[PDB]
Amino acid sequence: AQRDYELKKAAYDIEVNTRRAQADLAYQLQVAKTKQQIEEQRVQVQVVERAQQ
Amino acid sequence: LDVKFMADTKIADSKRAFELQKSAFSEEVNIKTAEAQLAYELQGAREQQKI
């Protein structure tokens, strides 16, 4: 009876840990994507600055 | 004890559904949270261009 319960617990824990790992790291991925858009415009100022110089 | 372990399994299957959905919802919240924080720079850097 203990074994029958232990195996389902471990089986469900695989999915819970998997989904938690995804959710945990989901923030930094978007932070990278957002910075990707930002940096393009940060250095775009250099182009405009040089053009007036 | 036989009924105990079976009760513990059903509690775990209930737990499973909840934690799974928390994770799904947190991904959505986390995603739009980053955008809300960084939008000031996305606009700020874009405005420095005209300035």
Numbering used by the authors:
A (entry chain B): 212 to 264
B (entry chain A): 202 to 252
What text appears in the publication on this structure?
We conclude that the cage consists predominantly of 22 each of Flotillin1 and Flotillin2 in an alternating pattern. With a final density map for the overall Flotillin complex at 3.5 Å resolution, atomic models could be built for much of the molecule. The final model consists of Flotillin-1:1-422 and Flotillin-2:1-402. The wide end has a diameter of 32 nm, the narrow end 19 nm, and height 22 nm. The wide end contains SPFH1 and SPFH2 domains at the N terminus. The wall is a single-layered α-helical barrel, and the narrow end consists of the two α-helical layers described above, one with 22 and the other with 44 α-helices. A β-strand from each Flotillin makes a 44-stranded β-barrel inside the helical layer. The narrow end is made by the C terminus of Flotillin arranged in two layers of helices that run in opposite directions and are linked by a β-strand. Adherence to the membrane is mediated by the SPFH1 domains, which penetrate one leaflet of the lipid bilayer. The Flotillin cage, by contrast, uses a hydrophobic surface that contains covalent lipid molecules.
In this study, we demonstrate that Flotillin1 and Flotillin2 coassemble to form a large, truncated cone-shaped cage whose wide end is always attached to a membrane surface and whose narrow end is sometimes attached to a separate membrane. The entire wall of the cage is without holes and is likely impervious even to small molecules, forming a diffusion barrier that can connect membrane systems. Through membrane attachment, it also alters local membrane curvature, which could influence endocytic and mechanosensory processes.
